[PDB]
Amino acid sequence: MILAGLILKLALYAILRLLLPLLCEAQILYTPMIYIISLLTIILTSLATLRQIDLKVIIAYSSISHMGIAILGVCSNTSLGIYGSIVLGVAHGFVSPALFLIVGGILYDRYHIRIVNYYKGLTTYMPQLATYIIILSFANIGTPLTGNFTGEFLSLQGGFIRNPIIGGISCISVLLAAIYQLKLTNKLTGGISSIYMHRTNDVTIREKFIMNILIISTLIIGICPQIMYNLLYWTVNNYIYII
Amino acid sequence: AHVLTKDMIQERIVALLESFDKVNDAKNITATANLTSDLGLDSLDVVEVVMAIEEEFGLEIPDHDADEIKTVQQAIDYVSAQPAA
Amino acid sequence: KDPWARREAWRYQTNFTRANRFKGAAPGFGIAVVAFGAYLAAEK
Amino acid sequence: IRASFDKAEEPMLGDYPDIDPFPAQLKNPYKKYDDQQDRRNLEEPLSVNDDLYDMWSPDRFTHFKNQDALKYFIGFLTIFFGASYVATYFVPEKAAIPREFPYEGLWKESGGTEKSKAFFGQRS
Amino acid sequence: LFHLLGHAFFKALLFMSAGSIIHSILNESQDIRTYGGLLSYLPYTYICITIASLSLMAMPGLTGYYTKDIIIESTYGSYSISNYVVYWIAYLSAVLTCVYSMKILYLTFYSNPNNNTITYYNAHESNIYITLPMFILAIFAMFAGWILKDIYLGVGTDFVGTHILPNNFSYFDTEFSITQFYKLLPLISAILVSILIVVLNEFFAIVFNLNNKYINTVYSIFNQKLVSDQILNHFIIFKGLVTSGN
Amino acid sequence: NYKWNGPLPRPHVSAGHRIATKFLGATMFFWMFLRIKEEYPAMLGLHNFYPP
Amino acid sequence: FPPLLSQEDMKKHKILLAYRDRCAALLVPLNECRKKNYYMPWACGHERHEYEMCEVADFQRRVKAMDKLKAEKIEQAKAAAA
Amino acid sequence: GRYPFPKDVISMTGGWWANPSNWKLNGLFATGIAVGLALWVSTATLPYTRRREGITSESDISKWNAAAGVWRERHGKISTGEA
Amino acid sequence: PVPFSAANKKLVTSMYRQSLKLARNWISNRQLFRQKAVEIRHKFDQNAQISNPRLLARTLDETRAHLYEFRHPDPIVPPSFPGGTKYERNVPPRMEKIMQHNLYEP
Amino acid sequence: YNAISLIIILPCISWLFPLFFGRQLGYVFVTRMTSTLIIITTLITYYYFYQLLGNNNPINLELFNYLNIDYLDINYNFEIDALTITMLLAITTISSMVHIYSIGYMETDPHQVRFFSLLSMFTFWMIILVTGSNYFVLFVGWEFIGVTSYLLISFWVTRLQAM
Numbered sequence A: 001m002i003l004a005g006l007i008l009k010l011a012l013y014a015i016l017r018l019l020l021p022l023l024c025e026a027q028i029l030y031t032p033m034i035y036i037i038s039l040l041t042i043i044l045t046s047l048a049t050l051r052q053i054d055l056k057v058i059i060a061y062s063s064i065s066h067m068g069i070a071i072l073g074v075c076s077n078t079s080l081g082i083y084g085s086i087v088l089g090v091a092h093g094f095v096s097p098a099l100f101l102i103v104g105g106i107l108y109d110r111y112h113i114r115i116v117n118y119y120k121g122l123t124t125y126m127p128q129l130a131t132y133i134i135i136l137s138f139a140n141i142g143t144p145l146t147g148n149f150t151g152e153f154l155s156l157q158g159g160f161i162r163n164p165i166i167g168g169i170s171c172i173s174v175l176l177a178a179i180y181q182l183k184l185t186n187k188l189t190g191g192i193s194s195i196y197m198h199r200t201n202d203v204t205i206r207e208k209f210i211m212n213i214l215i216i217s218t219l220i221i222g223i224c225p226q227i228m229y230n231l232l233y234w235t236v237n238n239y240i241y242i243i
Numbered sequence B: 001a002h003v004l005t006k007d008m009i010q011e012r013i014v015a016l017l018e019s020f021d022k023v024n025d026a027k028n029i030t031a032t033a034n035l036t037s038d039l040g041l042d043s044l045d046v047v048e049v050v051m052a053i054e055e056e057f058g059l060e061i062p063d064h065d066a067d068e069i070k071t072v073q074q075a076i077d078y079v080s081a082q083p084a085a
Numbered sequence C: 001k002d003p004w005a006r007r008e009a010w011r012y013q014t015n016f017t018r019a020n021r022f023k024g025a026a027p028g029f030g031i032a033v034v035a036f037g038a039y040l041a042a043e044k
Numbered sequence D: 001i002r003a004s005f006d007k008a009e010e011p012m013l014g015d016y017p018d019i020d021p022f023p024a025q026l027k028n029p030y031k032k033y034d035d036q037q038d039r040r041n042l043e044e045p046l047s048v049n050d051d052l053y054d055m056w057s058p059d060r061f062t063h064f065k066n067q068d069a070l071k072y073f074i075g076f077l078t079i080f081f082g083a084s085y086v087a088t089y090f091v092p093e094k095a096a097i098p099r100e101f102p103y104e105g106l107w108k109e110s111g112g113t114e115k116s117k118a119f120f121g122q123r124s
Numbered sequence E: 001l002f003h004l005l006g007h008a009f010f011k012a013l014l015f016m017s018a019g020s021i022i023h024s025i026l027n028e029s030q031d032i033r034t035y036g037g038l039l040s041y042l043p044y045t046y047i048c049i050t051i052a053s054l055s056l057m058a059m060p061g062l063t064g065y066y067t068k069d070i071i072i073e074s075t076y077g078s079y080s081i082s083n084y085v086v087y088w089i090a091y092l093s094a095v096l097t098c099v100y101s102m103k104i105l106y107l108t109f110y111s112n113p114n115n116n117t118i119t120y121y122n123a124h125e126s127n128i129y130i131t132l133p134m135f136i137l138a139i140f141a142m143f144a145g146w147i148l149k150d151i152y153l154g155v156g157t158d159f160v161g162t163h164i165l166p167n168n169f170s171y172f173d174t175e176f177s178i179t180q181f182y183k184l185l186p187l188i189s190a191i192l193v194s195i196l197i198v199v200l201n202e203f204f205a206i207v208f209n210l211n212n213k214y215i216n217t218v219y220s221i222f223n224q225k226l227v228s229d230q231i232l233n234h235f236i237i238f239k240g241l242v243t244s245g246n
Numbered sequence F: 001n002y003k004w005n006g007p008l009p010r011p012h013v014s015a016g017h018r019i020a021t022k023f024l025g026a027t028m029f030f031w032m033f034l035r036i037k038e039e040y041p042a043m044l045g046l047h048n049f050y051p052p
Numbered sequence G: 001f002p003p004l005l006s007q008e009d010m011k012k013h014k015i016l017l018a019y020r021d022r023c024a025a026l027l028v029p030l031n032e033c034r035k036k037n038y039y040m041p042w043a044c045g046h047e048r049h050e051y052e053m054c055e056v057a058d059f060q061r062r063v064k065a066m067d068k069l070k071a072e073k074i075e076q077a078k079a080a081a082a
Numbered sequence H: 001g002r003y004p005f006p007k008d009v010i011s012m013t014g015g016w017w018a019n020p021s022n023w024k025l026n027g028l029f030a031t032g033i034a035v036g037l038a039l040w041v042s043t044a045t046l047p048y049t050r051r052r053e054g055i056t057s058e059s060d061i062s063k064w065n066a067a068a069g070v071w072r073e074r075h076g077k078i079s080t081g082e083a
Numbered sequence I: 001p002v003p004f005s006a007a008n009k010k011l012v013t014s015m016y017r018q019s020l021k022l023a024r025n026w027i028s029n030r031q032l033f034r035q036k037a038v039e040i041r042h043k044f045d046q047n048a049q050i051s052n053p054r055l056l057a058r059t060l061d062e063t064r065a066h067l068y069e070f071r072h073p074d075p076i077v078p079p080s081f082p083g084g085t086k087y088e089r090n091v092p093p094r095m096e097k098i099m100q101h102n103l104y105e106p
Numbered sequence J: 001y002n003a004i005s006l007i008i009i010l011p012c013i014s015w016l017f018p019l020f021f022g023r024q025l026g027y028v029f030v031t032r033m034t035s036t037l038i039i040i041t042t043l044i045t046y047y048y049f050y051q052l053l054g055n056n057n058p059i060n061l062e063l064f065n066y067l068n069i070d071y072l073d074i075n076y077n078f079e080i081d082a083l084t085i086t087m088l089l090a091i092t093t094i095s096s097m098v099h100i101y102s103i104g105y106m107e108t109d110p111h112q113v114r115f116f117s118l119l120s121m122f123t124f125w126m127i128i129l130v131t132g133s134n135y136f137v138l139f140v141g142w143e144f145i146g147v148t149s150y151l152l153i154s155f156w157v158t159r160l161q162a163m
C-alpha cells in the first residue's frame, strides 16, 4: 500500500519540482521522447496484464498503466494536464491501496495463496465483498464520478494538445484499462463457489472501515475535483513555458 | 407448479410402449420386462424407444447410459433420478 | 411405414386439426366489421 | 502443440510434463468431473499456455474452419459493397429541380457579410 | 426520432410477449422448433404479439405505417442521386422483416404441436402483472403513432430545434414527388409476402425443408450471425490474447 | 393428463382472458378499418401532385 | 403563392431556416394555430391543407423547370455532334 | 424452487428471500424518508431552475452584438467568410 | 471393422442416435420428420447385411462422413441441460460452516 | 413541485433505497416501492410533455460546478428539450411497464431485491443520459448504463455464459 500509493507519486512530484522549472528549454526539444516512452508503457504494460496467473501482479501492472497516463499530462507544457496529473496522483493513491487490501489484504489472509485459478464464485458466500470487488474495479477503470476519470480525462486532453496523434493513439487506454480489470472482476465475482475453497468469514469491521474511507475519498474528488483547486491554481501556472 | 411421481413415469412409459408397433404384445408389459428379450426388440429398435423416452420426458441423455436402461424398471429408476421434467 | 403410428395421433386430432389451428386467428374481426359498418352508415 | 505458439515454447520447459492442449469447452459435459463448471478433474495437468484453453477462455467456434469463415465473411462484405456500387450506374434521374430560396440565396440568414457571401447562401 | 419513439412500443411488447410464451411452458424452452400449436391455449399473448407484428411490418392502420414506411419513402426523395440505391437496400429489409415475423407467428402458434403433451396440458396465462403491461403497451403501439404524428412529422412543425441546412432539406420533396408505384409497393409486397410465408409453411412445406447440400451451407452461414462472431473471436480476440502472451 | 395416447381436451381459459382478447382484437381491426378509410387516397397514393 | 414576407418578419416569427421561401406566408398562421391546440391531428386541418396546396403549386413549377432543363441537354447533345 | 440457504451470511440487499416479519413497520419508515427526501430536494432546487427563452431582453443582445462589433472592429478582424 | 458384437453394436447405435438427432434439429413439421426418420431407418435396415470386414468399414466411415456433413449450427438442447438456457441459474450453495482464519477476531 | 427534480431524484430514490434498506424492507415491499415511484415519475413526465406542447421553452436547472480551469467549465446542467422529452416519455413508460411486468415474471426468483434495484438504476442513468445539458453528463450516463449492462445481464452470477 505505501509503495503503490506513495512511493510512485513521489516521482510524479519530482518531475514537477526538479525537472520542469529549470529544464525549461531542454524539454521542448525532448518531450517527444517522453511521449514515446509513456505511450509504449500504456500500450505494452497494459497488454501484458492479460496473461497473468498471479493476483497481486495484475494490480501492480495496473499501477504502471495509470502512472504512464499521468506523466504525459505533466510533460504536456499545458495547463489542464498538470492539474489532471495531480488529480490522478491523489486518486490513484486512494483506489489502488484499496485494491491491495482486496488482493493480498483480505484474500491472502483467508487462503494464503495468490494464484488466480483457485478463485471463483466469491459472490455466494461473500456478497459484501463482491460489491467491493466491483465498485472498486469500476473505480479503477475510469468510470466517471470517481476521480480517476477526471484525471484520465484531463491528462489525455493535455497530451492531446501537445501532440494530437500521440493523444489519439493514447486514448485507447480507456479500453485497455477496462479489459484486464473486468476480466479479473468477472472471474472472481461469478461462477459456482470453488471446489478448493472452504467458506471463511465475511469481510470484517476493520476491512470495511479502511475500504469505505478509500471509496468516499475517491467519490468526493469524482463529484467535485475542485475541492483542491484552492491549492493548485498557482502550480497550474508555475510550470508552463509557452511564451 | 407440477411435480411428477413414480406412477406418473410408470403410466407414461407403459402408454408409450403401447403406442409403439414392433412390440410383441400389449399385455406382457411390466415394470421388469426386458426390452430386448421379452418385448422382441432389435439392437436398433430399442434405440428408437430410448429416443422417444428422452423426447417425451424433455430430458436428453448421452450414449454412456443409453445402453444402461435395458429393462423398463431401469428406465424408470433412471428418469426419477433427474429433476428435469 | 410408421413404427410410432398411434403416437402421432394427438398431433392431428380435433384440437389441432386444420380448422381449429386457424380458429381464433382473428378474434375481433367479426365484431369490428359490424361496428365499422355501423360507423360507415352513421357518419353521414 | 497444435497451434504455432504452443510449438514455440518447447525449448523453455525443462521439467514441465508437456501435455497436449485441448479446449475445456470441447470436452463433453456429461462426464462427471470434479469441476462441472470448468470441466476439469481435481489433479489434472494444465497445459503450457493454459488460459487460452480454459472455460473462461474465448468462445472458439467449431462449425466452420476459420480460414473458410474468413472467406465467407469477406465474400459477403464484397458482394454488398460491389453490388451497391455497380447499382449507382443504373440509377434513374430525378423529375424535380432542387428547390430554390429567396433573398439572393438566404446568404444573410445563415450568417454572412456582403464580402462573405460565397461561403453562406444557397440557390438564389 | 419518431421511429425511435414508436419503436420502443413495438419492441417492449414483442419482448414481454416472448417472455410470456417462454414462461408459460413447464420446460421454459426458447427454440421456436419446439413450441407447436399454442393458438387455442394462449389467446391473450396471441393477440398482443399480433398487435406487435402488424405494427412491426408497417401495416396500414397501426403506428408502424406512420413510423417505418416514410423512412423508406425519404430515400427516393433525397437530392443525392445515389440514394435511390438505399431505397431498394432499405426495401429488401422490409420484405425480410415480414418473412421472420411470419416465422415467429406460424411456428409457435399455428403449426402442428412439437413438444411433449404435458406442456399442452399445463399451458395457461399469467396473473395480472404480466397481462396488464402487455395491454397498455398494445394500446400505445396502436394509437401513439397517429396521435403523435403531427408533432414529429406534421408539416411546418417547429417543435424540435434541429437546424437543417436548407440546401439539404428534402422532406417537402419526399412527400409529394412520390409516385403511386413507389409508395404502393412496400405496403403491398409486405402484405403479400406475409401471406406467402404462412401459405408456403402450411400447405407445401417442402420448399423450406429441402436437404440441399448447397443451400444449407448458406443457412449455416446466416444462422451463425453472418459468420462474424467467429471472425471477431478468432482473428482479433484470440490473436490479441496470443500477441499479449508474446 | 388422463389420455397420453388420446386426443387432447379442449382448453379451459377463464372469462377475463377471452373477453380481453375479444376487446383487443375488436379495437385492432376497427382502428385498422378507420385509418384505411380516412386516408385511402393519401395512403394508397391517389391524387398525385404532379402538374398535368 | 402568397406574397413573400419582409426581411424582418421571418426574424420576428422565428421561422426555421429551411421553411423560409415564397410559400412561407401561410406557415405563420399554421404553426400558431398548432400552438393554440396541442399539435393534435384532428384539429387545425384547414390551414395545413392551405400550406400543402401552396406548396403543390410551388412543386409544379419545379417540375416544369426540370422538364425544361432536360430539353437543351438533348439539343446540345444533337448540336455538338453536327 | 425454495432450495435451502445458509442463514449465517449477512448481505445488505437482503440475501436469498428477504421477507422480515416487520416489513409493514419498516415500510412506514421507508416511505417517510422517501417522501421527506423527495419534497426537500424538490423545494431546495426551486431557485436554481430558470426558464430557457425570454430570460434576457432583446435590447441586451443587440447591444452585446454591438459591443462585439466594436471589439471586433478595433482589432481589424475580417469576417470568417471574407477571404 | 468387426462383425456382430458389442463393439460394433455400441458404434452403430451411437451413429443411429446421431442420425436421428441431426435431423430432429434440422426441420420443423413433424409429419416430414417422421417420414424422414422412417427412410433413415430404411437406410440402416437395407445395408445391414454386410458379411466382410472391409466393405463394412468402407460403408462405415463413409456414413460417418455423411453424418459429418449435415451438422447443424445449434442442436436442440433442453434448457436445464448444459447447452440450454436454464443451465446453472441458481445452483444451490453447499451447506458449509465458517472456516476461521484469525485467532483474534473474527 | 419542480417537475425536474421529481424527474431526476425520484428514480434515484428508487435505486438507493432498495440497496440501503433491502434486508430491512424485503422483497414484497420492494416490488411495490420500486414500481410506484417510476409510475409517478412517468405521470409527471406526461404532464410536462403536455405543458411543453403549450409553449416551446424548456426549464433547465444549474447545479454545483464540476470543474473549471482555463477556457473550460463543466457544470451539472439538466435541460428537458423537445428532443429530451420524446426520449423521456419513451423510457419512463417502457421502464414503468417493465417494473410491473417483472413482479409476476420474477415471483420465484430469489434475488429480486437486487433485481429491482438494478432495473430502477438502469432507469436512472438513462434519466440523466437524456436530460444533461453538456457533453459531459452525456458521458456520465453513457458510462453508468454500461456499468449496469454489466450488472444486469450477469444477474445469475452462477451461470458461466452470463458472465
Ligand SMILES: CCCCCCCCCCCCCCCCCC(=O)OC[C@H](COP(=O)(O)OCCN)OC(=O)CCCCCCCCCCCCCCCCC
Binding pocket: A043, A169, A172, A179, A183, D056, D057, D058, D059, E232, E233, E236, E237, E240, E241, J161
Ligand atoms: C474501421 C472502423 C473501426 C470500428 C470498429 C471495427 C471493428 C472492430 C471490432 C474489434 C473491437 C471490438 C472491441 C474489442 C474488445 C473485444 C472484447 C470481447 O469481445 O471480449 C469477449 C470475450 C468473451 O466473449 P465470448 O466468449 O465470445 O462470449 C460468448 C458468450 N456465449 O472476452 C474475452 O475474454 C476477451 C479478452 C481479450 C479482449 C480482447 C483483447 C484484444 C483487444 C484488441 C484491441 C487492439 C488494441 C491494439 C492497440 C494497438 C494501438 C497501436
Ligand SMILES: CCCCCCCCCCCC(=O)OC[C@H](COP(=O)(O)OCC[N+](C)(C)C)OC(=O)CCCCCCCCCCC
Binding pocket: A216, A219, A220, A223, A224, A227, H041, H044, H045, H048, J009, J012, J062, J063, J064, J065
Ligand atoms: C444525489 C442526486 C443529486 C442530488 C442533488 C441535490 C441538490 C440539492 C441542492 C444543491 C445546492 C447547491 O449545490 O448549490 C451549489 C453550491 C454553491 O454553488 P452556487 O454558486 O451558490 O450556485 C450555483 C448556481 N449557479 C451556477 C447558477 C450560480 O455548491 C456546492 O454545494 C458544492 C458542495 C460540494 C461538496 C463536496 C461534494 C460532496 C459529495 C460527497 C458524496 C458522497
